């Protein structure tokens, strides 16, 4: 069994830039996150092998966790606040995707996904 390459967290070719946006997304909500109860799952890409999944990575064909996103915010890997946003929705996506309602780990997500959204809510605008 073998995982694929964890999602790139770094890309010279890529046009990036800080904004008072991504800097929101990682002081507030990324922290917020990062530090719940439930967060251990998603604090780095699903280990496949490890975990005795077999079918995870065909299933789920654009694998994204909270260790990619933190290294892609402290890296200001991304253009715009949308970016990064997509990639906290494809985390839980990907969640509800492979798991059944009322499993544990999507109980998890759900609680992590409640905090996100209250903390995006209040995003400030674009200075
Ligand atoms: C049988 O299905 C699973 O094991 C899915 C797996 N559940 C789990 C999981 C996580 C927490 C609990 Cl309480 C129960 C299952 C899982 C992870 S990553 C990880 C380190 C684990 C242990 N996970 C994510 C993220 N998305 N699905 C999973």
């Not at 990036?16 to 996150?33: A, F, W």
């Not at 990907?94 to 009322?102: A, D, L, M, R, S």
């Amino acid at each position: 069994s073998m995982n694929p390459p964890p999602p790139e967290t770094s890309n010279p070719n890529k046009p990036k830039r800080q904004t008072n946006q991504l800097q929101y997304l990682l002081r507030v909500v990324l922290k917020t996150l990062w530090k719940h109860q439930f967060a251990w799952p998603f604090q780095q890409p699903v280990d496949a092998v490890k975990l005795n999944l077999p079918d995870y990575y065909k299933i789920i064909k654009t694998p994204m966790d909270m260790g990619t996103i933190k290294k892609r915010l402290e890296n200001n890997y991304y253009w715009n606040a949308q970016e990064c946003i997509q990639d906290f929705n494809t985390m839980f996506t990907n969640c509800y995707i492979y798991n059944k309602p009322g499993d544990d780990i999507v109980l998890m997500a759900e609680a992590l996904e409640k905090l996100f959204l209250q903390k995006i809510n209040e995003l400030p605008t674009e200075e």
